[PDB]
């Protein structure tokens, strides 16, 4: 017919990605209807750049989550090694999260193991620390923020070797103190373990999301 009218847009070439979206050139044809007998041709662009969607998910590689807490310091042949110069062992783990659609696995250790001495509930001589620096104002956004500092009854750690060779063959593994001991100090301000002072924060600005 005389009238020109564009047909539908369509890709020129296959989407140049194997997953997700990509950009491709697209085109359309003046054939809906075809101009004929000198009638006007379709006005406008015959081509454009445009998103193409494969609709196929891309691989997603796994990533480690954060390590969990160390397990209790223990030695497999013994009921309790607390408060003795006996290395035990301890471990913690983490999990590979998010792997999907043939993404890579997480590389590295799933479990971390170390040697340790247990001072869990051990009495130890204590001394009062000097004041810590003031902490953050808490709650940061809630009514009336306050910040704190502390003096702590700090235990004297027993003077064991920091490294030990478990095997006759040479090899000095670190050994780390683990557990909450029971430090002994005379009281300060009526307290045996922590003395704390607090101060309001002043002219607190509001928490507004910049967004």
């Amino acid at each position, epitope marked *: 017919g005389v009238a020109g009218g564009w047909g539908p847009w369509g890709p020129v070439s296959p989407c140049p990605v194997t997953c997700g979206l990509g950009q491709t050139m697209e085109q359309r044809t003046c054939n809906h209807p075809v101009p004929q007998h000198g009638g006007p041709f379709c006005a406008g662009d015959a081509t454009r750049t445009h998103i193409c969607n494969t609709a196929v998910p891309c*691989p997603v*590689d796994g990533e480690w989550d954060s390590w969990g807490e160390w397990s209790p310091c223990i030695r497999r042949n013994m009921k309790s090694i607390s408060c003795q110069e006996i290395p035990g062992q301890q471990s913690r783990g983490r999990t590979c999260r998010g792997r999907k*659609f*043939d993404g*890579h*696995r*997480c*590389a*590295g*250790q*799933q*479990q971390d*193991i170390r040697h340790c001495y247990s001072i869990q509930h051990c009495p130890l001589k204590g001394s009062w620390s000097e004041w810590s620096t003031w902490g953050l104002c808490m709650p940061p956004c809630g009514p009336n923020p306050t910040r704190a500092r502390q003096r702590l009854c700090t235990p004297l750690l027993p003077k064991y070797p920091p490294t030990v060779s478990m095997v006759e063959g040479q*090899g000095e593994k670190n050994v780390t103190f683990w557990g909450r001991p029971l430090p002994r100090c005379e009281e300060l301000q009526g307290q045996k373990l922590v003395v704390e002072e607090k101060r309001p924060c002043l002219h607190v600005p509001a928490c507004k999301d910049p967004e």
Partner: nanobody
Framework: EVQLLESGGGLVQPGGSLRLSCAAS????????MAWFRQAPGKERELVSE???????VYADSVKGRFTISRDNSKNTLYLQMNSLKPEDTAVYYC?????????????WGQGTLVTVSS
């Protein structure tokens, strides 16, 4: 099924190098990733390095820059080139191949080869 056969383990001094090889056979077209794992004394087996069919790789932080994984498709072999070896790399090392999920998702394993690094 895919069968894997590793070789190349041995005893080396710190700072030395060794190359592990693994020949793959069977339905190798079903494999998306090939990898090396290792099992050190006292420890669970861990992934050291892996390489996808398209060529992307991942390495454990403890071996990054020191170990290099690679494939020779013309020989259907996978390699782990280890340089700057340290005593803590001592372990049995295992070749592994993982299928695409669309082909069943199976892991396949070699028999293991021992790498010992000692002064």
């Amino acid at each position: 099924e895919v069968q894997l056969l590793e070789s190349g383990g041995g005893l080396v001094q710190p700072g030395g190098s060794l190359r592990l090889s693994c020949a793959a056979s069977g339905r190798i077209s079903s494999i998306i990733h090939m990898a090396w794992f290792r099992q050190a004394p006292g420890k669970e087996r861990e992934l050291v390095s892996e390489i996808s069919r398209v060529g992307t790789t991942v390495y454990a932080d403890s071996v990054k820059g020191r170990f290099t994984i690679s494939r020779d498709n013309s020989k259907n072999t996978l390699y782990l080139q280890m340089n700057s070896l340290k005593p803590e790399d001592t372990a049995v090392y295992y070749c592994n191949a993982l299928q695409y999920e669309k082909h069943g998702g199976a892991d396949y394993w070699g028999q293991g080869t021992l790498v010992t690094v000692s002064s």
